[PDB]
Amino acid sequence: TQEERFEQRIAQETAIEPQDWMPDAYRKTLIRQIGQHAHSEIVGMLPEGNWITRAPTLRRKAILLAKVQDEAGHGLYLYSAAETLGCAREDIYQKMLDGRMKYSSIFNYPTLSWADIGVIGWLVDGAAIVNQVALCRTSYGPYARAMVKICKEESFHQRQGFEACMALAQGSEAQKQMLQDAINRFWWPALMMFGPNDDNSPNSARSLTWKIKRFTNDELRQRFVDNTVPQVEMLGMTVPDPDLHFDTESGHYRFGEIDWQEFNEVINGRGICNQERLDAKRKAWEEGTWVREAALAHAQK
Amino acid sequence: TQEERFEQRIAQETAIEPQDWMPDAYRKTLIRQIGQHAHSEIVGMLPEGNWITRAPTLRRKAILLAKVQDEAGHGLYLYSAAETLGCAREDIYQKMLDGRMKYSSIFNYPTLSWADIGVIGWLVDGAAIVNQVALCRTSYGPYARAMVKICKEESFHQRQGFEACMALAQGSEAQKQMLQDAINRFWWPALMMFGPNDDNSPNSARSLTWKIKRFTNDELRQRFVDNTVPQVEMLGMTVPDPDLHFDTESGHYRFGEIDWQEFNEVINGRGICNQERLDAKRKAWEEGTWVREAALAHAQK
Amino acid sequence: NQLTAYTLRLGDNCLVLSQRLGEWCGHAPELEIDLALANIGLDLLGQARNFLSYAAELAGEGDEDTLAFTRDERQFSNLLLVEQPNGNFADTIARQYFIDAWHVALFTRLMESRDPQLAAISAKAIKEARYHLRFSRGWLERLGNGTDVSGQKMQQAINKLWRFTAELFDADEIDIALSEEGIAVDPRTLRAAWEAEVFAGINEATLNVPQEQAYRTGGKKGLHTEHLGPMLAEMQYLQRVLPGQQW
Amino acid sequence: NQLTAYTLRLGDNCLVLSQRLGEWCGHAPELEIDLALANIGLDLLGQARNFLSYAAELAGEGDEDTLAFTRDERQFSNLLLVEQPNGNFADTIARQYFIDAWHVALFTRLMESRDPQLAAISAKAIKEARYHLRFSRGWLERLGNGTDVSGQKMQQAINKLWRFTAELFDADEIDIALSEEGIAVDPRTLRAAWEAEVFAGINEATLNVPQEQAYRTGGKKGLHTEHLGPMLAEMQYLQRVLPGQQW
């Protein structure tokens, strides 16, 4: 009845809480998912940070600083939620540095223009929101509640990102080209944020059963594509996909095949920025040592 | 007759050579002068280095790299000449870093525009050349011969510096303003290169007697002003000096009073870049340690 | 034009200092410091944006953006203290601390201005300055009274930067003409407030106040160190490449 | 166009690397190194001017300056290896080694090109390249077969640049089609000569040819690391502020 009552709570949809009983594999898979979610928020600071000092207007710059401040904040919220399941913040953070845990594939791509920042703000935050909204009804309560607080905050910046893109869409010929190019370098990497196929998803069986995950990786990806394409046509831009078109009979946008061979390299640490990301965090950690140690020895007097 | 034969050489003007006899104070004062001459060549790389990565054209950039390569070279030539009098290169270089020896007052000023580089190339090299030409007939042979080799090389770059300034004098309104402002921040500091007054020159008595120095600080400075002013009028620029005008009856350009109180701060290490310059060299020396040490331990196998 | 220039200096301090903290994003010793530094940089940029908009208004042409992106290093007028490089974490803290103590002293007196908007802006600004000063004074003592290694580091950061403090109390023709109308704060008067906060702060960390007489000034009349030029080169690139565009 | 594309790749390699060495000026361990470094940079810049000047000619528009100064990071076609930070002295040595070895191999064969100008440029260039390889090898042995510290920093300098060596032998549609006409050198045929030199050099330094497979390409088609944008901002700043002038 231990396992049996749990099964019902899930099934009736009563939110699981920190000091409830839960299967050992359910706890471990949630530390894994929530940890990596926080890792994403932290790593995600780097591509965006890269353009702070270079942002084109004081306004756009102020918004970008706001955004990065809110990302650190969301990381901390997610580590709190993580720690309610028995793990240590510092323990899993060290796993991220070592590469023993992942973070979102998306931040292994570089910001090579200002348009990049807008497109991350619009598509990449858009893709993360589509996924986070669907996580608002996740079985675990601290997770699902964090997901609500976050979607509330993050979608303000998403609209900011979109407005930045709108400015380029409507600006000089040179501004339009800049955006088109950012879209081109980010569209496919955005789709991969949702994870592999339904045929190649080892976690998907359990996650759906325990209502940790509410929709399949392909389902959410399809939702994203359906929301986003009209947003692209609105800006008078295109998506780098010859096979993309609307399919009357199914009422979805049918879209092209993902380069899974790239996806596999990126998650296995051989993407573009992958190393320059871990290096950056590893460096911030090691050079920061004397500072944390000083803070400790001071709190002792 | 030891002291007596020396007196005659110097007089009829037979150059002195490394393994001759010379007064102990004549040796000490020449290590001082020639050492500081080399120090100048090395420090002088920093203000010019500052603009390499930023130079406006590949041509101008190449010239600037040439110039800085030739300054290092002239430093080494001057240390060789220095070492012929019994000192060690590394010994006096360490004194430079400690601030126990000087280098030219002029390099404690910062390069704040591209025009600065041209004006250094034209006025500051010009002022060094006026001084070095007069040193071609210095009593000591290794010094005097070094001065010939150098003036030959350095005046190619001086004409380059002047041509760079010519390009600004003849360019857009914005380019002309840039040069005028470089001139304005460099004219007075250039005049101080020649050193203090004839009334305040402790070294001058002996130096002139031993024909180490051929003309007084004021005499050379007067020469520089006389050569340079028509060059300024040619460019259609002005000099930041209300009192400057041509004096028929003496046939010289009479010019304004030098701010000696500034001069005294600059030489005593309290100028604009003094600290930044020694810091830069001190850092290059300390961080370079492991490299010199590795080179040593390798030459041992 | 005097008032205009006086405004610009205050805004320039904020804008340039802001850029410096930008560089720390993603690289802090911990996430809590990262977020703190972002939070400070954001306040300062807000302050910059306010002062800049007032100057533009006073001049009656351009705006915050033209003033930040289309001026060259010779026309910037930030203090020399803010343009210094981040260095290690102490070099950042030390700079921040001398700057906060001075902002807390400045804005206090400056909300009392006989210029409405300078007083109006300083009123909003003093609220943040104290939070900055709590943060920076905090770490100053955490590092000063930390380990052997951190204390030496914090001492040498304090020393390296000291010579630029002279400019905080330097009163030129513009300060004087405007401080004789109670518009500007005369910077010589701020000395005692600053010194009383900073000597005690340093002493309380078991470090020593530097003994060199601080002597570097110049930022305000556009005579900068060699650090500003490449900062601006980075800050303005996009605007230089594509001028007069809505972003 | 394909020939232009190629010239630009070669020219951009030299120009970018050139910029990197510019930063070392004044800051080296000893003066001789400073002078050595200034000189290598001047050769490389020299090489860049000829390749770009030719490119400008194939194009029939602009010149070495327009190509150097009015293109953004998405247009530069340099190797990703040339843009990496200078780091510590061993970092700079490692990069210069991998590069000169490559240049030696490449220009030795490019003086054969059926395009006279390319051949003419590489004939001048190979002379310099051999001096550079002497220099960069010079220090590889000195630091690997030196003190424990130095051998160690050197081992790491090599490890951290290694992933980029992949691009020296990557051949794309332009390298292939121009190589069939015997104008270009297929980068793939350069592997042999490069490995023979480098593998030897590293092992003679008593170090390790890294086990990890290299995978970083893209520079050649405008997809760079996050280091180039900031170089181009520092390098182009003035031309951007004041375009269309003579200097």
Ligand SMILES: CC(=O)SCCNC(=O)CCNC(=O)[C@H](O)C(C)(C)COP(=O)(O)OP(=O)(O)OC[C@H]1O[C@@H](n2cnc3c(N)ncnc32)[C@H](O)[C@@H]1OP(=O)(O)O
């Ligand atoms: C932009 C931002 O601020 S955060 C961006 C979005 N971030 C997140 O969604 C992080 C939280 N995680 C999740 O929502 C889920 O893990 C999903 C939907 C991304 C993936 O589904 P899962 O059930 O966890 O994994 P799945 O079985 O589909 O895939 C197998 C493996 O690839 C990983 N993976 C899938 N997509 C990615 C990706 N985009 N980046 C990195 N790893 C990924 C999975 O985590 C799993 O690895 P693991 O077991 O070592 O942790």
Ligand SMILES: CC(=O)SCCNC(=O)CCNC(=O)[C@H](O)C(C)(C)COP(=O)(O)OP(=O)(O)OC[C@H]1O[C@@H](n2cnc3c(N)ncnc32)[C@H](O)[C@@H]1OP(=O)(O)O
């Ligand atoms: C740009 C370049 O590449 S190098 C620039 C020019 N550099 C040089 O000429 C360096 C070689 N030195 C000389 O020619 C001479 O020392 C002079 C003409 C500069 C000065 O005359 P001196 O007889 O040496 O000194 P003098 O009695 O006139 O002045 C007293 C002190 O002021 C110093 N001094 C004078 N001018 C300068 C200056 N511009 N910068 C620094 N120190 C100076 C003198 O060196 C002396 O100090 P010291 O005894 O500790 O070395």
